[PDB]
Every structure is written in structure tokens, then in C-alpha cells.
Amino acid sequence: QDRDVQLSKALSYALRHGALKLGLPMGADGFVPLGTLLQLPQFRGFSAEDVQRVVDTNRKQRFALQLGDPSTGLLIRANQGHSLQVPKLELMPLETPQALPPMLVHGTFWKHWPSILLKGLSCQGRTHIHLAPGLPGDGIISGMRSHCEIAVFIDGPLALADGIPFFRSANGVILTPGNTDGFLLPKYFKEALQLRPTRKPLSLA
């Protein structure tokens, strides 16, 4: 079972970040033949049904699978979170404020809170900042981690008014490249909320 946890992690890294360094033949849409991946050293211990299990029982739908042809087999991608340049990846462009989700919200942790207040939310390594289109139940909402302590909400219409684009992934995640350096500046911060161990509001600028 942990092997499924290990399979997902190895799948996440290879499909999101390390593929052109691993030799895999990935297209500009982020799709790679699954067999060529399962031929890699770290993947040689897994079966196409193991990967199939991880793809369907995954609650965040991190990976998409496509039939392909028999000469290539199944095509497998990650839906979001890429360090690689995949310009043709399936993304819904949220170009007007009326297409945006009800609320944009990023959940993070105290260790990073002072840097976010002073520099803004950063893409960090990834190509897009990851936001949720809502808060979760007592919930696994995709686009947000599970053990977050504080959540900060984003003013979507104001960011768009300043030419900061937004995108929706095929698994419900909202993405933005930020500004030039990959930062969502603290001006587009509308509201903040501490989540654990008690729901309390947090102050900003």
C-alpha cells in the first residue's frame, strides 16, 4: 500500500518536474507514454494496473490517463503542478472576472506567513501559484493541502485588472503565474483566516 504512496510520489515528480532530465519523451501538453516511464529505474517495479489503481483512487485527480494508440500505449500526465514547460497543457483560461470561481483561497503554514506578508505568494519552483475555488469540509478540496494552518483569500478581479492571468486545471485547481518574478503581491490579498487549531481572522497590511 505504501508502495502506492511511493508510486504517486515517483509519478508526481517525474510527470511534474523530472522527465526531460530522465529521458522520457513528453510532449508540449505534458503527456508521456506510460510504458516508457514504467521502464525507468524507479518505475521498473510497478505494473500498469498499479499505476491504474493510483490514477483512479486518487482523491485530488493529480493524474490524467488517455488511451493513446497500441504503438504507444496509454498516455499519462499530471493535471497541474509542473516545473516543466508544457505550453499545450489542458488549462481553462479564466480571462474575465465573471469566469472566476466563487472564492480564491491559498492555504499555507505559519513558517512561511512572514515571507508571504512581505513578498507575496510565490510560484516557488512550479510555474503557477495554486489556489482552491473554495474551503473544505470537516474536506480534501483540490488545489489546497490537507494540514494547512492559515488560509489567505485573493482578490481575483483586481489581479485580472492588473493583467495577472488565471487558469483552471482539469481537476479543479486555479493557477496563476503571478507577476514577472512569480509573486502574487500582498495588494491582491483580500482576507486571511487561521484554520487550526481554531478559526480566527488574521491581520494584514
Ligand X SMILES: Nc1ncnc2c1ncn2[C@@H]1O[C@H](COP(=O)(O)OP(=O)(O)OC[C@H]2O[C@H](OP(=O)(O)O)[C@H](O)[C@@H]2O)[C@@H](O)[C@H]1O
Q: Does 179 bind ligand X (CB under 6 A)?
A: no
In one letter, which amino acid is 170? Answer: A
Shorter beta-carbon distance to ligand X: residue 73 or 113? 113
Q: Which is nearer to ligand X, 53 or 145 (CB)?
A: 145
- The answer to whether residue 62 forms part of the interface with ligand X (CB under 6 A) is yes
Residue 124 makes contact with ligand X by CB under 6 A: yes
> How far apart are alpha carbons 28 and 32 in whole angstroms?
10
> What is the C-alpha separation between 179 and 186, in angstroms, rounded?
12
Helix (DSSP H) and strand (DSSP E) numbers for the chain: 5, 13
Amino acid sitting at position 17: H
Q: Going by DSSP bridges, is the β-strand pair 104-108/150-154 parallel, antiparallel, or unpaired?
A: antiparallel
Burial of 103: CB neighbours in 10 Å, binned 0-12, 13-18, 19+: middle
Binding residue (CB under 6 A) for ligand X from 11, 55, 75, 130: 130
The reply on whether position 108 binds ligand X by CB under 6 A is yes
Closest alpha carbon to 85 in 115, 125, 117, 56: 125
Quick one: which segment of 66-74, 94-102, 105-113, 190-198 binds ligand X (CB under 6 A)? 105-113
Residue 126 in the binding site for ligand X (CB under 6 A):
yes
Contact (Cβ atoms closer than 8 angstroms) between residue 30 and residue 78? yes
- Nearer residue to ligand X within complex by CB, 60 or 168: 60
Which is closer to ligand X, CB of 73 or CB of 145? 145
Query: With binding defined as CB under 6 A, does residue 122 bind ligand X?
Result: yes
Q: Which three cell numbers stand for residue 114?
A: 512572514
**Site map 1..40 versus ligand X, x via CB under 6 A:** -----------x----------------------------
C-alpha to C-alpha distance for 64 and 35, rounded to whole angstroms: 15
Of positions 121, 150, 164, 175, contacts ligand X by CB under 6 A: 121
60 makes contact with ligand X (CB under 6 A): yes
Q: What is the DSSP letter of 132?
A: B
Q: Which residues bind ligand X (CB under 6 A)?
A: 12, 60, 62, 81, 108-109, 112, 115-116, 119-122, 124, 126, 130, 143, 145
